[PDB]
Design a protein around this ligand. Structure first.
Ligand SMILES: *[C@@H]1O[C@H](CO)[C@@H](O[C@@H]2O[C@H](CO)[C@@H](O[C@@H]3O[C@H](CO[C@@H]4O[C@H](CO)[C@@H](O)[C@H](O)[C@@H]4O)[C@@H](O)[C@H](O)[C@@H]3O)[C@H](O)[C@H]2NC(C)=O)[C@H](O)[C@H]1NC(C)=O
Ligand SMILES: *[C@@H]1O[C@H](CO)[C@@H](O[C@@H]2O[C@H](CO)[C@@H](O)[C@H](O)[C@H]2NC(C)=O)[C@H](O)[C@H]1NC(C)=O
Ligand code: NAG
Lengths: 355, 95, 9
């Protein structure tokens, strides 16, 4: 709910004691309590000002170790005070597994834990040390309730793996396979549970981003910009303008439920090869999806503007969108229907009345 | 489930020998997970087996306690395992 | 919907 990771308990102070934090090489959260020092280790960079000593008075101290991925904060609240362990904890990790920790020391008391993947308040046996790691296997069942970020992250790393070396794969994937995967990917992006307003999956040759739309989003247009560093791959940057009508709930729609924006940015056309295998500028294929919605006959069009290096001696640039035939099981094709092109030498803009 | 079959070949009160049919595709490695069926996901355990192997040994279990054992296949080829992991096959073994 | 800019000769 409110944080990615919460580990709480009580500490019996039998003497003047210290707080110690280290950045671990391993992606674990390690908590080790000795009589003189409470030690916390996490994969995040150490904040440079971490206080050395705990409050002088002896007694029982309630504590909670907090991690939040989008706030980038790993802080330890302790008794009446709060200690900031890391200020740059913005890294995709999923804590759902406790490892056996056989360290000796002063056991912690009334310990409990809850994470994003395991949101229940789970009491743990008291122990001098605790180790929190992740499962590698996908333990989330086929509930369709929510998709796990780290599971989706590995799936998108798998696709990126194929885009880098599509010649190396064991098979040339059929159209039905690719269509099934792109449906699955879209489905998982609309249902993935995360804490921030935006979640981006940035991989080699693919970048998928999820926007949690506000109720206010229907009121105003949406502007999106990207950065690609101007290498000589023929495409350098893009911008998007999404009209307010695209985000508007339908006339007979109810409940004002949250909707999501999906921008899947491909730097590869491996999944979009028509018959005759037509080429696309910079292999750029840009997927735009409003969750479970099709809009058509737009007054103000969605516009896609692309900066590129010109190669116009024997070629013209035409804005198109990928269309497939359900019940064909055959490769798709490009269509320019309802999409107007303005193609200056170094810049081209696509004006489409639908997405 | 890419592993077509999953069976227990042998067992002791605390240990287990599982076996599974390999699929007709390249498997890089398998992931075996096991835990007490009613226990919390924090306590679950897992290890890896090379994809050339079709058996595994699970030991250190409590006697007379139901355990859920799950086997995923895995590889790095998107055209074989698009979600990197297969669909799981699971047994519930009492021991 | 996947938008792209076709290269037509
Ligand atoms: C799972 O649930 C348990 C139980 O609710 C959570 O433990 C609770 O953790 C919070 C935050 O650390 C504790 O709040 C503190 O309360 C003290 C005051 O001391 C209390 O006084 C009452 C009587 O008034 C006693 O009954 C309590 O035992 C305790 O001594 C305050 O000074 C602190 O500033 C802080 O607000 C809370 O006391 C504690 N509850 C129990 C029963 O231990 C646990 O965090 C949760 N785990 C999660 C969410 O992961
Ligand atoms: C992947 O795409 C996302 C969304 O297009 C990018 O996030 C945006 O980055 C720009 C900088 O170019 C920021 O101005 C925006 O604010 C970001 N979006 C949001 C919602 O905050 C992200 O940079 C892209 N990553 C890569 C590697 O290309
Ligand atoms: C704390 O430590 C003291 C001795 O160091 C011990 O007697 C006591 O039981 C411990 N626990 C509490 C809650 O005081």
């Amino acid at each position: 709910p409110r944080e990615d990771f919460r580990f709480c308990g009580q500490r019996n102070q039998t003497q003047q004691s210290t707080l110690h934090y280290d950045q671990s090489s391993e992606p674990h959260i390690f908590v080790w309590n000795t009589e003189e020092t409470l030690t916390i280790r996490a994969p995040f960079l150490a904040a440079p000002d971490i206080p050395r000593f705990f409050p002088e008075p002896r007694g029982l101290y309630h504590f909670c170790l907090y991690w939040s991925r989008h706030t980038g904060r790993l802080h330890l609240r302790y008794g009446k005070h709060d200690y900031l362990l890391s200020s740059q904890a913005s890294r995709l990790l999923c804590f759902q597994k406790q490892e056996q920790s056989l360290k000796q020391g002063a056991p912690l008391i009334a310990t409990s834990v809850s994470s994003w993947q395991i949101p229940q308040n789970t009491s743990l046996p008291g122990a001098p040390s605790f180790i929190f790691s992740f499962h590698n296997a996908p333990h989330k069942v086929s509930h369709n309730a929510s998709v796990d970020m780290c599971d989706l992250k590995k799936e998108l790393q798998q696709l990126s793996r194929y885009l880098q070396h599509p010649q190396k794969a064991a098979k040339r994937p059929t159209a039905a396979f690719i269509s099934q995967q792109l449906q699955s990917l879209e489905s998982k992006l609309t249902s993935v549970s995360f804490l921030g307003d935006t979640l981006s999956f940035e991989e080699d040759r693919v970048n998928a981003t999820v926007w949690k739309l506000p109720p206010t989003a229907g009121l105003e247009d949406l502007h999106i910009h990207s950065q690609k560093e101007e290498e000589q791959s023929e495409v350098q940057a893009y911008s998007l303008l999404l009209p307010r009508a695209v985000f508007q709930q339908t006339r007979g729609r109810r409940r004002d439920d949250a909707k999501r924006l999906l921008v899947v940015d491909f730097s590869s056309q491996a999944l979009f090869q028509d018959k005759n295998s037509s080429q696309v500028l910079g292999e750029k294929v840009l997927g735009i999806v409003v969750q479970n919605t099709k809009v058509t006959n737009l007054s103000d069009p969605v516009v896609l503007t692309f900066q590129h290096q010109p190669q116009p001696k024997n070629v013209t640039l035409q804005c198109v969108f990928w269309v497939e035939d359900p019940a064909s099981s055959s490769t798709g094709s490009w269509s320019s229907a309802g999409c107007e092109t303005v193609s200056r030498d170094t810049q081209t803009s696509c004006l489409c009345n639908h997405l | 489930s890419v592993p077509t079959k999953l069976e227990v070949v042998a067992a002791t009160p605390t240990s287990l020998l599982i076996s599974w049919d390999a699929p007709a595709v390249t498997v890089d490695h398998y992931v075996i997970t096991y835990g007490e069926t009613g226990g919390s996901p924090w306590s679950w355990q897992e290890f890896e087996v090379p994809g050339s192997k079709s058996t595994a040994t699970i030991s250190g279990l409590k006697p007379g306690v139901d355990y859920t054992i799950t086997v995923y296949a895995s590889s790095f080829d998107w055209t074989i395992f698009p979600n990197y992991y297969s669909s799981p096959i699971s047994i519930n073994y009492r021991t | 919907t996947y938008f792209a800019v076709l290269m037509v000769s």
